[PDB]
Amino acid sequence: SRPRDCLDVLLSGQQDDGVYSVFPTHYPAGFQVYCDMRTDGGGWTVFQRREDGSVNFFRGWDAYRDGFGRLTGEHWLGLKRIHALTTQAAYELHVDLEDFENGTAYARYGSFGVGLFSVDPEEDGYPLTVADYSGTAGDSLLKHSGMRFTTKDRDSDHSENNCAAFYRGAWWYRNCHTSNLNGQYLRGAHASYADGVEWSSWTGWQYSLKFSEMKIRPV
Amino acid sequence: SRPRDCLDVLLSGQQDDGVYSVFPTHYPAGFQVYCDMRTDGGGWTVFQRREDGSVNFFRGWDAYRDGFGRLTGEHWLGLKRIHALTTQAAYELHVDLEDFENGTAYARYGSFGVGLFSVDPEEDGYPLTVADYSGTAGDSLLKHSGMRFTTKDRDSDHSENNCAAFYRGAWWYRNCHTSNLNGQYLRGAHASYADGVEWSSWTGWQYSLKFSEMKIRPV
Amino acid sequence: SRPRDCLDVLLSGQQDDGVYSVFPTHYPAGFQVYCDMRTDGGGWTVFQRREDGSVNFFRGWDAYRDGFGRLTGEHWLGLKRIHALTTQAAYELHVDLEDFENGTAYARYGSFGVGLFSVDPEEDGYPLTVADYSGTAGDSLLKHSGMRFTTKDRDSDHSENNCAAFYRGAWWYRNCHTSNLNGQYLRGAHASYADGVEWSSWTGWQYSLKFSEMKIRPV
Amino acid sequence: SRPRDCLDVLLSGQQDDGVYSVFPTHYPAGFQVYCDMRTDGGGWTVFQRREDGSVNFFRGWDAYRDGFGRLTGEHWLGLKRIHALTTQAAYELHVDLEDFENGTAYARYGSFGVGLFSVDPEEDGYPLTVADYSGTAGDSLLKHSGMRFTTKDRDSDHSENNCAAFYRGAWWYRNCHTSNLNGQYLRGAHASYADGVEWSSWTGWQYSLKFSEMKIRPV
Ligand SMILES: *[C@@H]1O[C@H](CO)[C@@H](O)[C@H](O[C@@H]2O[C@@H](C)[C@@H](O)[C@@H](O)[C@@H]2O)[C@H]1NC(C)=O
Ligand SMILES: *[C@@H]1O[C@H](CO)[C@@H](O)[C@H](O[C@@H]2O[C@@H](C)[C@@H](O)[C@@H](O)[C@@H]2O)[C@H]1NC(C)=O
Ligand SMILES: *[C@@H]1O[C@H](CO)[C@@H](O)[C@H](O[C@@H]2O[C@@H](C)[C@@H](O)[C@@H](O)[C@@H]2O)[C@H]1NC(C)=O
Ligand SMILES: *[C@@H]1O[C@H](CO)[C@@H](O)[C@H](O[C@@H]2O[C@@H](C)[C@@H](O)[C@@H](O)[C@@H]2O)[C@H]1NC(C)=O
Ligand SMILES: CC(=O)N[C@@H]1[C@@H](O)[C@H](O)[C@@H](CO)O[C@H]1O
Ligand SMILES: CC(=O)N[C@@H]1[C@@H](O)[C@H](O)[C@@H](CO)O[C@H]1O
Ligand SMILES: CC(=O)N[C@@H]1[C@@H](O)[C@H](O)[C@@H](CO)O[C@H]1O
Ligand SMILES: CC(=O)N[C@@H]1[C@@H](O)[C@H](O)[C@@H](CO)O[C@H]1O
Ligand SMILES: [Ca+2]
Ligand SMILES: [Ca+2]
Ligand SMILES: [Ca+2]
Ligand SMILES: [Ca+2]
């Protein structure tokens, strides 16, 4: 009756993809999420989806903290929810990607968390833990490990300017990125540099992907 | 001991209309509501009542989010509470209406929700889900399906101006309305256009109804 | 283990006056209170105490909502806590009073609540329910029944000016008062009109009492 | 499954130092802490650590209320968390100290709390309860007993100026201190007066200690 994530939902006998209530250890009010019950046996809690450019992702700090969009479409679950999920157990991250020629690729990370040891994860900038790459998309996240989350209105990156402003996104920017999945929905090849839905190791710095899904499952 | 709504209250053996504590899945602190234990077998959770013009309904965003008035009289339960109720199960909506000549009518909607898949229902504007009309008042809500909630100080409608300002209410306005049950208590026929307690399919756009009650029950 | 008030604390076998954790129905985090386990068999939850003038009571809205002072001395528990207590069951109010000549008196009210049916008790001004006087101090509260709570920075009274500013207190003021137990600690007879710790039916409008305690118990 | 502190964690069979979830009586959402399972049998909940000067401690009121830094390194758990822990039972305080010549000392206090009887511990300034010194570092805290917590942006001390501003820290300042463990990480002997990580009874007023840990355990 109180699953902590989509894997508890699956193991309780819910096999269909869709929206479910989950109740993280330190977020006992709980909230709804999209559960992927198909990928590698299922039990994945979605926290990011791009598929059509219907939702504005060029949002400030409060929106990235609290979440935006709809669970059934393009959304960002919110860093306060991603923190509550990833601190309650050891999670892996799965990233699904699709181009406009219906090509697909994925990146799996054996460890993933946000603000794991932060007393105030919001003040500390929800810093990224990520390690142990495998898959077909190539690694575009390991260089972001240890970076705080940066938005157009709150700069915690390693750049003289604001990486989020410059690359029209919100991410764990260093100086600045190898991945930008919260970037502008520019729809494939673009002249502007690295400011779309980029996964540089698969499609480079001038190709805005059609589809992205970021999702977590206990190791 | 922890009913989720007025139907749980009724099925627990409370048969009297009145104020009860309910505890929605994602609002575990709970809150008090007015329960209608008579209509079509009872178990209806009230979220809106007009009966006398004693309460100001021309209120801003925060008041429509948090609720106002009194459970025993004219009130609005608050969109944060209506969201918590309608996302925890599939609800139907019942609307009771009365004119100043003691005529009555009702509208039943087989599905009703507010912000059903919204990650942040407040930021997303508590959008309306409504379908499957039946009853005697005629349908004045189906055209509002998919619209965000608009107040005098927060415009999310499909109009060049603010529908809430123009029609002195707060509603899931398109451009602008077929219903306005949070409109001014103008007391029957009025010269001003559509800015009273209107249900256009029953009494048209220049008749402010005497009584309205909006209430929900699990399908 | 989760008493809802000081009467649950007493009936659980705690017989000593002092500070205890209580957990009201709609405030499940709970909070600490002073329990009077002596008066008329005990089980009284204190929400107001004056005894020495050590604490400033001439405070604004936020302080009267959230509480101030110390449970072991002069304090105001806070209208958000008094609301959570008095809406969860039917309470009686006991008021103990002492003058500077060690005279004592009390007022008992068979029913007492704050914001009982208010959807947003804070927006609605935590209105007073009180009835059924008995005791030795005389009735100085029944005329306040139905009034909202007024502070120096938030006027909801029936006066052309601010009763809280004028009588240097915070109360369910009409125009303006018969009681002012949150008034200035002026220490007995005073020239200034009605701006001390007044209980007019016992000591009139120019006598600031030495001691007051307001406390509640389920009927 | 719901330990209230690190002693419950230890007695449940967790013997390793590290980060654990705890759930104080009036903070049922819970939070993570560093548990010291070694000192005097173990079961100590850490709330302060200095070890390297990597974290800025010269922070304002909100940061001292909410916490900052990382549980695995330098941090301050936050006065709202320290209040929730120390009001739920009778705690003792242990302070470990180390100089830059690898000398160590400790101070044990048989009673310790923050805002113990405060209705609003934040408004009341999270006042210190401390008594019953023993150990090797000497007593540098008893003179602070009864003082409110003071930061650069919120002065509650007994000084004509702001003790936190003057001594570049945050503490239960009187006029001004015998201890300053949230002071500047100045690294040993310094010319500036008393504005480093000072424990005056061990190393005087011009020696910024290398290491400090403040931690609590039920008496
Ligand atoms: C990519 O997959 C989608 C969804 O499964 C397909 O609809 C696309 O097929 C193309 O578009 C459809 C509507 C139809 O015209 C078909 O003949 C096309 O091949 C598919 N391919 C591309 C290039 O988008
Ligand atoms: C509508 O119903 C109400 C409530 O049941 C009635 O009180 C009204 O009756 C009218 O008003 C009462 C006070 C009395 O004068 C009676 O003779 C009237 O018919 C009733 N009718 C209307 C038109 O409001
Ligand atoms: C009122 O009661 C208090 C507390 O029980 C007493 O202390 C007072 O007694 C008076 O003050 C004490 C200190 C002592 O001087 C005694 O002889 C006095 O009678 C008591 N009376 C008054 C008038 O305050
Ligand atoms: C203090 O303790 C630390 C940690 O246990 C030691 O590393 C220090 O030893 C000194 O530094 C190391 C790196 C090595 O050079 C050794 O030979 C030194 O004695 C130790 N001493 C001091 C003075 O910091
Ligand atoms: C999108 C992005 O961060 N791109 C480049 C990075 O590849 C490059 O190595 C660096 C050199 O300074 O400049 C960054 O802006
Ligand atoms: C109250 C309301 O929305 N009324 C009218 C609507 O019936 C009409 O079809 C439309 C034409 O533009 O103009 C709206 O303002
Ligand atoms: C303290 C207080 O409210 N006193 C008086 C009240 O007794 C009096 O009847 C009234 C007449 O207008 O004026 C009020 O101010
Ligand atoms: C750091 C600190 O508080 N030091 C001194 C204190 O030792 C001294 O007794 C006092 C005299 O006024 O002045 C304080 O500032
Ligand atoms: Ca920068
Ligand atoms: Ca508009
Ligand atoms: Ca007034
Ligand atoms: Ca000062």
Instruction: Please state, in angstroms and rounded to a whole number, the distance separating the CA atoms of residues C159 and C153.
Output: 14
Instruction: Please state, in angstroms and rounded to a whole number, the distance separating the CA atoms of residues B77 and B81.
Output: 7
Chain D residues closer than 8 Å to C78 by CB: 119-120
Neighbours of D219 (CB within 10 A): 11
Q: Is B171 helix (H, G, I), strand (E, B) or coil?
A: strand
Instruction: Please state, in angstroms and rounded to a whole number, the distance separating the CA atoms of residues B175 and B159.
Output: 5
8 A C-beta contact, residue D6 and residue D45: yes
Q: Is A80 on the interface with D (CB under 8 A)?
A: no
Q: Is A31 on the interface with B (CB under 8 A)?
A: yes
In units of Å, what resolution does this entry have? 1.8
Ligand located closest to C199 CA: 7
- DSSP characters for D164-212? HHHTTS-B--SSS-SEETTSB---EE-SSSS-BSEEHHHH-SSEE-SEE
Distance B189 CA to ligand 6 centre (A): 18
What is the identity of the amino acid at D103?
A: G
Q: Is A27 on the interface with D (CB under 8 A)?
A: yes
User: Which chains have 3+ CB pairs within 8 A of D?
Assistant: A, C
Q: Quick one: DSSP state of residue C195?
A: -
Q: Is A117 on the interface with D (CB under 8 A)?
A: yes
Distance C198 CA to ligand 11 centre (A): 20
The candidate with the shortest Cα–Cα distance to B81, out of B18, B119, B32, is B32
Helix (H) / strand (E) containing C109: strand C104-114
Of C30, C70, C77, the CB nearest to D25: C30
Both tokens of A52, joined, read 């059509």
Instruction: Please state, in angstroms and rounded to a whole number, the distance separating the CA atoms of residues C184 and C207.
Output: 11
Query: Could you tell me the CA-to-CA distances from A163 to A82, A167, C19 in Å, in that order?
Result: 22, 6, 53
Whether residue B107 has its Cβ less than 6 Å from ligand 6: no
What is the identity of the amino acid at D166?
A: F
CB within 8 Å: A68 and B26: no
Binding residues of D for Ca(2+): 155, 157
Distance C180 CA to ligand 3 centre (A): 26
Both tokens of B66, joined, read 């948090």
**A62 appears as a binding residue in the annotation:** no
| β-pair type (C44-50, C68-69) | unpaired
This structure was determined by X-ray
The candidate with the shortest Cα–Cα distance to C164, out of C42, C60, C73, is C60
Instruction: Please state, in angstroms and rounded to a whole number, the distance separating the CA atoms of residues B109 and B76.
Output: 19
Q: Is D69 on the interface with A (CB under 8 A)?
A: yes
Atom 3, ligand 8: which residue's CA is nearest? D176
Distance C167 CA to ligand 11 centre (A): 12
Instruction: Please state, in angstroms and rounded to a whole number, the distance separating the CA atoms of residues A39 and A41.
Output: 6
Residue of B nearest to A66 (CA): B120
User: Would you list the domain boundaries of chain A?
Assistant: 1-137+211-219, 138-210
Neighbours of A134 (CB within 10 A): 11
Give ∠ CA B68-B69-B72 in degrees, rounded to 5: 135
Neighbours of B79 (CB within 10 A): 23
The candidate with the shortest Cα–Cα distance to A174, out of A133, A131, A141, is A141
